[PDB]
Design a protein around this ligand. Sequence first.
Ligand SMILES: Nc1ncnc2c1ncn2[C@@H]1O[C@H](COP(=O)(O)OP(=O)(O)OP(=O)(O)O)[C@@H](O)[C@H]1O
Lengths: 86, 835, 316, 86, 154
Amino acid sequence: AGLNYEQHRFGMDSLCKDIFTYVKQDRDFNTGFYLRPQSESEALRNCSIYLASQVSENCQGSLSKFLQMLLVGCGSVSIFNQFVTE
Amino acid sequence: KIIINLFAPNLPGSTKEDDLIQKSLRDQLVESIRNSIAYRNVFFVDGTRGAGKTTFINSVVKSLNSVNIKCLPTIDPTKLPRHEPILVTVTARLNKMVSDKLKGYWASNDYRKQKEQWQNHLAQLQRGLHLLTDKEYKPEYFSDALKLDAQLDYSIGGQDLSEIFEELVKRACEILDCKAILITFDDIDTQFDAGWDVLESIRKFFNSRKLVVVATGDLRLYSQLIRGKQYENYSKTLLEQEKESVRLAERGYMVEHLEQQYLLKLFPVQKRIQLKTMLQLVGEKGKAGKEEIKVKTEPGMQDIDAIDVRQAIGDAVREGLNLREGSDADMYVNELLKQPVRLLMQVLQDFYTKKYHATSLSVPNLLRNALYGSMLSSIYRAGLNYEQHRFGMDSLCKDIFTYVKQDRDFNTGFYLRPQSESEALRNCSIYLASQVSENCQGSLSKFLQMLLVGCGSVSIFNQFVTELDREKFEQLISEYVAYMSVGRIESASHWANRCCAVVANSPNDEKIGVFLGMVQLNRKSRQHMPGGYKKFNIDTENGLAKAAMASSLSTVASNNLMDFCSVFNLIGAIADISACRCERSAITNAFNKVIAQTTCIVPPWSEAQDDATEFSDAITKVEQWLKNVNEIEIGIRPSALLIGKVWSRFYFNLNNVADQHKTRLYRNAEHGRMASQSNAAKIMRFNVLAFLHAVLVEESLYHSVSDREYIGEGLRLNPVTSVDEFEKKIKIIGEKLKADNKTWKNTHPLFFLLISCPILHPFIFPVGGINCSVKALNKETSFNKLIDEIVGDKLLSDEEWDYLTKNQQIFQNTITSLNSSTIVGASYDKDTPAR
Amino acid sequence: KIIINLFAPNLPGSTKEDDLIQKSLRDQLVESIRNSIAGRNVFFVDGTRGAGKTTFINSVVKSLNSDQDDVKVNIKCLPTIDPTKLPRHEPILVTVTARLNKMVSDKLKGYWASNDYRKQKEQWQNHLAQLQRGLHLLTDKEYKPEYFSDALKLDAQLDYSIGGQDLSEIFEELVKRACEILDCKAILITFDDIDTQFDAGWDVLESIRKFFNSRKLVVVATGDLRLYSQLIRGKQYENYSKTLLEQEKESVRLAERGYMVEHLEQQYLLKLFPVQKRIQLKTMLQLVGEKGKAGKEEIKVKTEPGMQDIDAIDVR
Amino acid sequence: PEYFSDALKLDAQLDYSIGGQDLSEIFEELVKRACEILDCKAILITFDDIDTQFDAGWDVLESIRKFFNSRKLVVVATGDLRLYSQ
Amino acid sequence: LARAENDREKFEQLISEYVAYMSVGRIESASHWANRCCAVVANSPNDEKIGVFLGMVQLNRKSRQHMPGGYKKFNIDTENGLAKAAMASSLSTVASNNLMDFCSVFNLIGAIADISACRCERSAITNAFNKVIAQTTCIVPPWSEAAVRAEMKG
RNA sequence: GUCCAGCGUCGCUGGAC
Ligand SMILES: Nc1ncnc2c1ncn2[C@@H]1O[C@H](COP(=O)(O)OP(=O)(O)OP(=O)(O)O)[C@@H](O)[C@H]1O
């Protein structure tokens, strides 16, 4: 699928890039950031579960990491769809 | 009598005399062969692919081997080596036949002379066989060519392989003591590149009167074989140069004349035999068939009990597709009979084998498995889905769209009739119809999804999108499929919200806010409203009216937020609620699933009172309703046609309502009593009557559990403005069911469940949308009484019903604010005409 | 009941344990073969979604090695690893003789010398040498006149009904002789995937319908039909006259030729792999069923080392 | 065709799993003998990139998927996937 | 509807529809053919929109708003014995956007064609006569623009 | 004839009386 696949070097830096490089291939800017397994490609359906698990691990037990996911991870996708895409 | 056993090998090598389908033709051909030798002498058994040609020939050969003719072993040029001349193989078969005869003579006083006569003839053929092998002319054989033969004294000099083989057969016949020899060629269907060598050998070598040939194959293939070989006699330099239209037109004619003349000289037309198909043998419908055919569906079935081949497919189709007996069901079985017998036999041999194993059910599951395997090739060429494990509601809703697109008939292509002229699109309709009747059987939530998603997407696109040419067509097609996201939807309610955006963008005349089933209310207050007209607000409604009105709200964001009141949303909520009964909180998550949790953008192609237990009663009624649904819906048998017809009526009904109300708003439409004045409550009232009306008529006529229609004679219309058309039919149905000792639940399960739905009841009787006149109340009161009887509980009390008809109370079951709402683009300046 | 122990003693990969997952399907298919053997016996096992089709087939092969009607089974032959110019007729023939040769060499242990031992071995060598001579007419490109003498040459033994070489019959006698020697009822052949080498399928499809049509032979082929359909359709255009293709291309004959080629392939697939014989592998969802429904057989999973089977929890 | 009689001269040596003149099984026993003689657990085969002339890379791939599949052989290939895919 | 020289597949397809619709080659009944012929010729009105046609004339089922003199609707019940029998053998109805009535002369020829092939006794004459005079409806042709509405209302 | 109602783009058609 083209996402990050290094065994280490996991953090806030790569997760936001992975989310935006997944919706771009899924062509779903409306509700694509829920990371749901509804897709026509077996590669993409396998990536949806992996991505969802990574989110719950990173922003667990902290407040700032949660707020970063709300803004950077999901805000960028929704902002792009309404304004830039036109 | 002909009886076919399904639990048998059913192969050309394991068929007996009582199993053949063309027994009449076999006797006709055998007599003709005997007559020809008793008084170009070649036959041709015409038959399309998979019509059972080898099986027929084997019967002909075996019957003649039971006026004395010796039959050679059957020869098919496909299995032969790619470079072996036919004359080599045929003379090899003769060698085995005569040698076995000579050995039986044991010691022979005078037949030893015959043996050396045979050996010399075979050696003579061997010397001259190099003519068919040489790639270059070799002149040192010329002295050998000028060798006079002292025996049989050939009139014509030279090798002349034609005259040598004519002698060879003549000596063979006397050894075997017969008067004819039969050479049987099988089909060249698989590899017709090597069928040319057979044709040349027949034309140039088998010309004697002691040889009779029975060819086998289909003529259309032979036409393309010969016509292709007639183009290679031209000089390529000539075809390369004279490439103008006039010369090409004349040259093509010449090849056709030479090609046709070739077949007449090879296979005379008076000898041709055409293999009848299955439809011709059993006739059409009740017409007396020329022959009767019976099968054995269960193992061990005796000969005395056996069902007709028309009935054998008749019950399978009428049960697998959940389609009622009639002309519509007879259209499918007539088509299945036209398929080649190999394909037809494989479908039957799979369905009845699996079904008996299950019995040792879900019959439609058995039919879909059989058709998918048999008609797999047509699936691939049509571009349909072919993933077995991905079968479900989502895949089926996309296959319908990708089929009608190739059918180029958006108006009525979702009926899945087998009417397309393309063979692939005719083998896919029977397959798809088996898909709908399987996934949709036994559930109401799945049924409503098909009626909305499966057929709604097709009709909406054809009216509001295609009016916007090859490059643009798939451009809109690609844009529309992804934007509304068919095949990956999340819920019917979310789909309906996306449906609001598509309809709204396209402008209409007078710019009135009324649309196809949706009313565009107002968000910003406008000054100087006559009467009590004011902005719509959701706070006024208290109980079930507040919940029901909430289920019919959708917001679209395009330079300005817009509010509609769509009937499509109600179908979504009903489809969403009845999904499961596992949890109680599910039936309150559906009310507020989309109301204020998401926003929809304009499509790209556009040109530009404790306040905590308020829902304690509405949830309670809905919870009790799900008890009835979970029991009645088990006996539901929807069809691929029933869903198609209900949408056709429902779609037509909505389009009429939206046109006969754009001009009936005026200034004093509030408290609308006269039929000439309408408000936002009447418009939304008929949009839910129309949905209920279409279910009533079409379910009665086409649904499987009802054996005979109950509507009766007379025209069937729709309630565009009045209500008496809808109440008229219920009264007729009420009497007929009562007189026949029957109940609604056992004949109209789809209508009974929908009419007794807590969500729709507030919309049926809005406050401001009830006709009032001297004659109207006769229809309304009778209609109100009839509905309360079907459900079993009266919806409205005496004081409630009195206030609706006649000129303050806490209405827990009716909308009180819609009639006073203001619709955008409706500039109230006119007045109601008086008459 | 089905129990899977995650804490297997050796901690193997994939935790196969016992009974696998398709024990119901495996016994069903094996029962189906025995019925037929007691013309066309082609079984198609569809391995897709990256399934372990080879693992399932080998389970069938191993199961048939302990059989009441003891229909012995050959070894799997992948068409993508054989030499390119070696016909697919040879691997079965080599596999048959190798399997047969061990048994007759093992007859020495049972019987140091016997009448059947001396006669069967020399009879078998006669059949093979018979096939080698006729093997010349497979890869040859031009019919030399010398082979005519052999075709007219007659053998009083081996009971060759149809005259000529007729390589189909020569193989049939060899198979019939082998079954009697090994004391079996049928010889089973398995064909693996063709995914790695696309074109290897055609030389197998034309070998099933030419030499493997017999009463005492059963085959089990795997793969997917998307490649097979494209393989058959490709070979149905190569017999059209090359000149005709550039001449009659007036946009009407293109439709006629396209409609006819799709007809020939459809009748081709139904001839080799019948619908009634095609088998499909159940998935986990279809085997445990949807939640709230009993569905098919239930499955239990262990979660801790030394966990009693009385407490194993459902897989869902 | 004359090699048909050359084969079928079956030998019990090495107890081959399958009959025939397959090179893969013969090469495998060749490696096993060499490992015993050299007293090494396994043999490592190292290839090199094919950037200069990538037509020769096909013969490498065929000889890896057919003849190098034992547990005594480790293969280390070098190249560029963007070139191997073409 | 479909030009002969502009297109061939469209014209050839239109032939197939006409062969099936008129039931040519099946010949269920001569009267059946006559009823179908009414639908074909009533599809295309003339410029003046008069109710007269090739061989038929379009009668009125519902009386119009007002009448000048003695003009009125049909009221078939007025006719006496033999005249009613001839009348009913000529009346026909077509299932279209709205129900329509005709008085086609081809129906009269159809009636003669059905009776004249009897070769029976008096008992079968009474039945065959009764079968000729009845009410028969025929749907509009597929190529018409009112097919979908007629299928629903009818 | 009257009244309600339904199709078509005033015409046509259905029901009650
Ligand atoms: N007389 C028959 N009795 C029973 N089944 C029959 C009969 N004829 C045909 N069939 C069915 O139809 C199939 C047609 O097979 P058949 O090989 O005869 O057809 P074909 O297309 O002419 O092929 P071939 O290339 O062998 O000539 C049979 O396999 C069988 O299923």
